[PDB]
Structures are given as C-alpha cells and as structure tokens.
Write a protein that binds this ligand. Structure first.
Ligand SMILES: Cc1ccnc2cc(C(=O)NC[C@@H](N)C(=O)O)sc12
Ligand SMILES: N[C@@H](CCC(=O)O)C(=O)O
Lengths: 274, 280
C-alpha cells in the first residue's frame, strides 16, 4: 500500500471538504463522465478531504495498470520542495514533497512536480507526463515585454513580482547569477502557495506572479481579468517522483509512455486543462 | 578501456548530418566529429570496409557536451542494419538493435522514446520534445489525427491521400491505435522525408504524418512557408528524443544529470538556436 503525497494545485489537484458523512460529493464533468474522487488527508492535525483532478486521474490509472493500493495525503508543509541548509552547518535537507519522499513519509509524489537536475540527484523521476514551462501572470492591460522589462530588471515597490516559496522557481532565482537583482526583490514578496499568489494578482496586491504555465494558462482561461506573457526561460516537464529504492520505477515510466501513446494523457488534458 | 564507448547514430538532419571526409587529409573539418560507416563490397557478401565520415548536428553537439561533462571517449558509427529501430520477428534492428545486442553502449540521434523500446533499452531523460505531427499545404483543414478524414478515410470522396515513412515510432503508433487508418495509408508510404515533401509539393499527397521535431524543422525552412504543421505545430503522443543505453547501464545516471544540467543552464536553448530555427 503506497503512501502518495500530493499538493493542492488546480487543475492538477483540487481539494474540497467532504460531505457531513465523510464521503465526497458525486460530481460529473462537462461531458457527463463521473469525476473520480479520492479521500486525501491533510492539515488544517490532519482531516479527511476530497481530492480530484488531472493528477488524481493519473494516479488512479497507474494504480489500476500496475496493481497497487494507496492512500493519499497532502504535503504537511504545503511546499513542493527545495534543499535548505540545516542549523547554519554545511549539511542540507529537503522540505516539501521532496522531503517527505526522502524521509519515507511518502513512497510516491503524484503532483505537478518539476523535473530538474538538482532533484534528480536525490530522487527518481518518471518520463514526463506533461511538458510545460514558466510564464508570468499579470492583470489584463499590464503589458510585460518579457524578462528584460524595466519593471523586472530595475525593481521597485511600485511593481511587485514574486513566486511560491520553496518551489524550484524560488531556487532557480536564488542560484542564477543573472537573476540576482530579481531575487533580492522577490525574496521580500514570495507567497506560501500558488492559490494565494493568484488571488493576490486579481486583488492587485501582487502585480506579476512567475509560475508554471500549465497552471497559469489554465487560470487565465478561467478568469478573463488575468493573462499570461508566454514562455519565460527553458521548457520543462512534470514527472512522478519515487525513491531510488522504489521497485515500481520501470513500470511507472512504461505506464506514462503507454498513456501518452494511446491518447489517455491527451484525454486528461481535454478533461482538466483545455 | 572502460571509459571508451561504442556509440551508434543515424543520419537525420538537423539532428545528425553526415559529410564526406576531405580525402586529402582524412580528417574531419573543425566542429565535426569522425564517424565510421561500414560499406559492403557487394550485395552477396558480409565483406566491407569502414569508411571514415564526419558527423555534425544538434545531437552530435549533445554528444560532444556529454563526452566533456561525463568524461568518456568514444568511437561513433552509423547504423547499417535498419534505421531508428523496429522489432521484426521479435528481433530489434536499427539503433535500438545495436544497443540491445551490445554492439553499442549508447545510441545518439533523433531516436523517439516509446513504451516498446523502453522494454529492451533504457532511455535518458528526453532532450528534445517530439511526438507525432501532421504536415499539409497551407489551406488544408485537418483537425488532428482523430479527424475522420484520417480515421475513416473512405467516407470521403475523394479520400485524403496521406502517409508516413514506415518502420519507425510513428508507424508503430498508428498501427497500434488506428488499424483501418494504418492499412489504408500503406499505399502512400514514403521512402523518406525528402520524398514526402516532394509528394506534398507536387499534389501526390495531401498530408504527411511524421515525427514532430523534424516536421517543425522542415516547416520552419520551407521555401515560401507553404508547408505547415496542423494546429500551432500540435503534437500527438508527446514524448521526446532520448539517448538509448543498455538495460542497467552504468552511464545512465550521469547522462541524465548532464542533460538536465544542459537544459537548466541555457545550453540546450543555444543548440536549438544554432540548429533548429527557421524563417517561417
Ligand atoms: C526555471 C524553470 C524553467 C521551466 N520550468 C520550470 C518549473 C519550475 C517550478 O519550480 N515549478 C513549480 C513546481 N512545479 C515545482 O515543482 O516546484 S522552475 C522552472
Ligand atoms: N524518430 C522516429 C523516426 C521517425 C518517425 O517514425 O516519426 C523513431 O525514433 O522511430
């Protein structure tokens, strides 16, 4: 029985209260297909909640394909995962879903988890289940000219930009020499969650949110006051995360490749994203 | 020498481009890498000679970067038994076969990651996004692979004339997913990409279904920007090109990490700019 960790992140993972009997409300897609829901425990002291979306569908497919049972919980600290110094020593540790997987609190990460060199040093990623990149979310009418725009390059309190703390976006800005000026600004303004940042853009408390295009393009498709700015840096992928010791690693990647090849992954897009 | 690796490739511009060696020097010009091609003496023989050739392209630049970063040397050769890889009577040929049968430690080229191949070789992380795209003349209305004009061709009069280049990942996919489409399109099989582009341009084909990355490149360079890919360059069955290694290869970890470092540090974008950009 696999411990799955995930994270709230529409449209990959919706998180809703249970009904009073502790079950999940029967709901249906646009096309009349039943929305598949799983009980996921998470913080408020954990309580049972209802989880669904692209990644939950994918989990269900993997579990059925490879013949495993599971229980899903939401990452305790609410973060994706970065590697941080311990106790002003030279030793580092991962937080977020990365940390839970490494510690054994999870056996698998099933989430919009960015595949990159730094995480791949510690965990195993599947082949990508989705290809995407970064973009910037702004209010309609804000006309950001890309990364070199003077509001980003020469920051002031007049135009606030930020990302999510303890995501790979945070660490990318922390580590790239060319982003040192941007990082010093964002460090003052980073949010705990994407959902909070997204609302802050709508509420004009944040002017630009730098985040995953899979997520931000979906937000802009649902909310006509919000727009994105196109590809920001290089392209990236989301992958299933597993320990190096996992016996499941080959079959997870084979099932992802199968699901791309037979149209299942594209069908998840049509359901949750388009 | 455990550090010295046999590596197989396959010509497919702009990923792998093959040129003749200057016969005077028998040395490849700067920026290219030596690559040997076994060329038979006749058709009735296994007898042949290795011909010294020179290889370049997007994938050869990745190989050079890997060689520097992961610290291996190599002898590069061109596959002569098939192309990318197909399973025939349960026996792999092409680059996949070279790796399966341990003649190559790795395969570097425009080699599509798919499920069936991943059962017999390990693949690196994807280093180029690809999948299946469809090329048409501008004006041609096709929604996608699921277009009834492809799935149920004979409902239309005249029926759409469309093909692929057989024996690779694209044909494998169509065969597996769309039986009627597959058997219909065998009549329009093209010997290679160049033949297909000529067929499109001379009205002998209405659509060409093929690897997305190559089609995007060809569309990008088409004289007059007449040939395009459907959608905005839409990709069915998204995957990538990957380096194929032997099952349980000791090189896979470092190759994966190096590729991810190249993407992360901007090096991969430089290579796309150098090799893959088009006017269109
Ligand atoms: C620098 C860079 C380029 C392209 N894509 C990406 C995604 C990134 C990211 O961290 N996404 C947020 C979350 N999916 C996570 O896994 O932490 S960084 C980045
Ligand atoms: N890249 C493909 C060849 C071309 C195709 O079939 O689309 C392969 O590795 O088989």
């Amino acid at each position: 029985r696999l411990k799955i960790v995930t994270i709230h992140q529409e449209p990959f993972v919706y998180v809703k209260p249970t009904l009073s009997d502790g079950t999940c409300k029967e709901e249906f897609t646009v096309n009349g297909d039943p929305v598949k829901k799983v009980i996921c425990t998470g913080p408020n002291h954990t309580v049972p909640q209802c989880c669904y979306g692209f990644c939950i569908d994918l989990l269900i497919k993997l579990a059925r394909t490879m013949n495993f049972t599971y229980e899903v919980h939401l990452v305790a600290d609410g973060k994706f995962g970065t590697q941080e110094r311990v106790n002003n020593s030279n030793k580092k540790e991962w937080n977020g879903m990365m940390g839970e997987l490494l510690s054994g609190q999870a056996d698998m990460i099933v989430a919009p988890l960015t595949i990159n060199n730094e995480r791949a040093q510690y965990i195993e990623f599947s082949k990508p289940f989705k290809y995407q990149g970064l973009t910037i979310l702004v209010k309609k009418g804000t006309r950001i000219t890309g990364i070199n725009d003077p509001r980003l390059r020469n920051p002031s309190d007049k135009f606030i930009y930020a990302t999510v703390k303890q995501s790979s976006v945070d660490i990318y800005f922390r580590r790239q020499v060319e982003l040192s000026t941007m990082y010093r600004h964002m460090e003052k303004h980073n949010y705990e969650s994407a959902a909070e940042a997204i609302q802050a853009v709508r509420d004009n408390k944040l002017h630009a949110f730098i985040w995953d295009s899979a997520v931000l393009e979906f937000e802009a498709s649902q909310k006509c006051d919000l727009v994105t700015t196109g590809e920001l840096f290089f392209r990236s992928g989301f992958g299933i995360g597993m320990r190096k010791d996992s016996p499941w690693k080959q079959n997870v990647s084979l099932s992802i490749l199968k699901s791309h090849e037979n149209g299942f992954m594209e069908d998840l897009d049509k359901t949750w994203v388009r | 020498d455990d550090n010295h690796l046999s590596i197989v490739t396959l010509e497919e511009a702009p990923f792998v481009i093959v040129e003749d060696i200057d016969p005077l020097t028998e040395t490849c010009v700067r920026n290219t890498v030596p690559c040997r091609k076994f060329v038979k003496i006749n058709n009735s023989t296994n007898e042949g000679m290795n011909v010294k050739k020179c290889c370049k392209g997007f994938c050869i630049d990745i190989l050079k970067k890997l060689s520097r970063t992961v610290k291996f040397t190599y002898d590069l050769y061109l596959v002569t038994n098939g192309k990318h890889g197909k399973k025939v009577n349960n026996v792999w040929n092409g680059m996949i076969g070279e790796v399966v049968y341990q003649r190559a430690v790795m395969a570097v080229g425009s080699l599509t990651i798919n499920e069936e191949r991943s059962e017999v070789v390990d693949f690196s992380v994807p280093f180029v996004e690809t999948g299946i795209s469809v090329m048409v003349s501008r004006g041609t209305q096709v929604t996608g692979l699921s277009d009834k004009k492809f799935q149920r061709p004979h409902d239309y009069s005249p029926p759409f004339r469309f093909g692929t280049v057989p024996n690779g990942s694209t044909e494998r996919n169509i065969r597996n997913n769309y039986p009627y489409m597959h058997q219909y399109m065998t009549r329009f099989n093209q010997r290679g990409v160049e033949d297909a582009l000529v067929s499109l341009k001379t009205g002998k084909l209405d659509a060409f279904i093929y690897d997305a990355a190559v089609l995007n490149y060809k569309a990008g360079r088409d004289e007059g920007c007449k040939l395009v890919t459907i959608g905005s360059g839409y990709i069915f069955a998204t995957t990538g090109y990957g380096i194929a290694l032997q099952k349980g290869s000791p090189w896979k970890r470092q190759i994966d990490l190096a590729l991810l470092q190249f993407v992360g540090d901007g090096e991969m974008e430089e290579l796309e700019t150098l090799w893959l950009t088009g006017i269109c």
